[PDB]
Amino acid sequence: NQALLRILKETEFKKIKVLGSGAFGTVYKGLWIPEGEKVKIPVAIKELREATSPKANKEILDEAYVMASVDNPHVCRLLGICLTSTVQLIMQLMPFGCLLDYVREHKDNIGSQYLLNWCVQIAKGMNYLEDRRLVHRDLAARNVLVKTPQHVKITDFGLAKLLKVPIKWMALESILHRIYTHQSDVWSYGVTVWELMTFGSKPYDGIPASEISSILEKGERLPQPPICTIDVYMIMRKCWMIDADSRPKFRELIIEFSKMARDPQRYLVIQ
Ligand SMILES: *CCC(=O)Nc1cc(Nc2nccc(-c3cn(C)c4ccccc34)n2)c(OC)cc1N(C)CCN(C)C
Ligand SMILES: O=C(Nc1nccs1)[C@@H](c1cc(F)ccc1O)N1Cc2ccccc2C1=O
């Protein structure tokens, strides 16, 4: 469906300032000024480094059409694309940033209701992606954007396969065998929840990435966050089982966290 994706000209968007760096390009804050329109729309612009992919623009545009057809409240959608010597991707701006920086900036004012609400919404977005046969591969708190404090969306899924490796978020079968499934995303979701329950701590802080596979093979896992009760830590612990098919499904994670969101004081102990 070609109509869903905007083909932009260089004069239809302007970069204002730099938001951050991705794995393959810089993300800017900018304005989208559609031709023959009286609108100037705040957007996020990601410009890929030139000649970083082997695929030509014809194949990259075909892949971008898929990213422009997702229809879910908790999943980001590609708005436009500009095909010059470099590819430039345009998306709606999320004014509050990524969820990792948000829980760090607002650590003192975040209660149990917010945290369990985020776990449900992320599992809903991931469950929609599994239904659409899309594998994320890079699910982390840095890739969960905040449109408003209680409305989050998942971004940058399928980026590796559509075109330096995030070891501390990957399932063990992905580290050892380069296998990426929807159950492989369940592992990363478990780490993402761990980032939120610790209010943005770094997983395996101080441990080199080359030792991570040895640590997981020994049986070590991320420690229990202090605010988590035993019922909450066991779920994220089950996301880290060696057998990917013994991990919980996203449909089950939605139900488990939704029930806890009914009685948030019973499951998260926050001062
Ligand atoms: C933790 C990363 C982050 O996203 N930080 C911020 C994001 C903002 N808005 C926004 N909107 C849509 C898409 C993105 C985006 C997507 N990708 C892949 C990104 C990579 C790096 C950075 C942004 C990316 N971002 C935003 O708008 C106000 C602000 C921030 N932060 C918190 C400001 C940090 N920076 C200025 C130092
Ligand atoms: O554009 C993206 N992120 C951005 N952040 C700031 C501005 S754009 C990212 C992406 C966006 C989205 F809504 C959903 C899934 C995604 O994978 N995509 C899409 C795409 C298509 C073809 C080649 C590269 C990319 C690529 O990197």
UniProtKB/Swiss-Prot annotation:
Q: Where is this cross-link: Glycyl lysine isopeptide (Lys-Gly) (interchain with G-Cter in ubiquitin)?
A: K17, K38, K55, K58, K218, K249, K259
Taxonomy, superkingdom: Eukaryota
What would changing D263A do, according to UniProt?
Answer: Strongly reduced phosphorylation
Query: What does the entry's PTM section describe?
Result: Phosphorylated on Tyr residues in response to EGF. Dephosphorylation by PTPRJ prevents endocytosis and stabilizes the receptor at the plasma membrane. Dephosphorylated by PTPN1 and PTPN2.
Domain Protein kinase, which positions?
A: 13-268
Keywords from UniProt, A to Z, are: ATP-binding, Cell membrane, Developmental protein, Disease variant, Disulfide bond, Endoplasmic reticulum, Endosome, Glycoprotein, Golgi apparatus, Host cell receptor for virus entry, Host-virus interaction, Hydroxylation, Isopeptide bond, Kinase, Lipoprotein, Membrane, Methylation, Nucleotide-binding, Nucleus, Palmitate, Phosphoprotein, Proto-oncogene, Receptor, Repeat, Secreted, Signal, Transferase, Transmembrane, Transmembrane helix, Tyrosine-protein kinase, Ubl conjugation
Q: What is the effect of changing G25S?
A: Found in a lung cancer sample
Consequence of substituting E10G: Found in a lung cancer sample; constitutively activated kinase with higher levels of basal autophosphorylation; more sensitive to gefitinib than wild-type
Q: In which tissues is it expressed?
A: Ubiquitously expressed. Isoform 2 is also expressed in ovarian cancers.
Question: Changing Q88R: what effect?
Answer: Found in a lung cancer sample
Cite the effect that the entry attributes to L159R: Found in a lung cancer sample; somatic mutation; constitutively activated enzyme with strongly increased kinase activity; more sensitive to gefitinib than wild-type
What happens after mutating N1A?
Answer: Abolishes phosphorylation
Q: Name one GO molecular function term.
A: kinase binding
Q: What GO terms describe the biological role, i.e. biological process, of this protein?
A: cell morphogenesis; cell surface receptor signaling pathway; cell-cell adhesion; cellular response to amino acid stimulus; cellular response to epidermal growth factor stimulus; cellular response to estradiol stimulus; cerebral cortex cell migration; digestive tract morphogenesis
What is the protein's quaternary organization?
Answer: Binding of the ligand triggers homo- and/or heterodimerization of the receptor triggering its autophosphorylation. Heterodimer with ERBB2. Forms a complex with CCDC88A/GIV (via SH2-like regions) and GNAI3 which leads to enhanced EGFR signaling and triggering of cell migration; binding to CCDC88A requires autophosphorylation of the EGFR C-terminal region, and ligand stimulation is required for recruitment of GNAI3 to the complex. Interacts with ERRFI1; inhibits dimerization of the kinase domain and autophosphorylation. Part of a complex with ERBB2 and either PIK3C2A or PIK3C2B.
UniProt disease link: Lung cancer: A common malignancy affecting tissues of the lung. The most common form of lung cancer is non-small cell lung cancer (NSCLC) that can be divided into 3 major histologic subtypes: squamous cell carcinoma, adenocarcinoma, and large cell lung cancer. NSCLC is often diagnosed at an advanced stage and has a poor prognosis. Neonatal nephrocutaneous inflammatory syndrome: An autosomal recessive disorder characterized by intrauterine growth retardation, premature birth, fragile skin, recurrent skin infections and sepsis, failure to thrive, nephrocalcinosis, and nephromegaly with tubular dysfunction. Some patients have chronic diarrhea, and necrotizing enterocolitis.
Name recorded for this polypeptide: Epidermal growth factor receptor
The shown chain, on whole-protein numbering, covers 700 to 982 of 1210
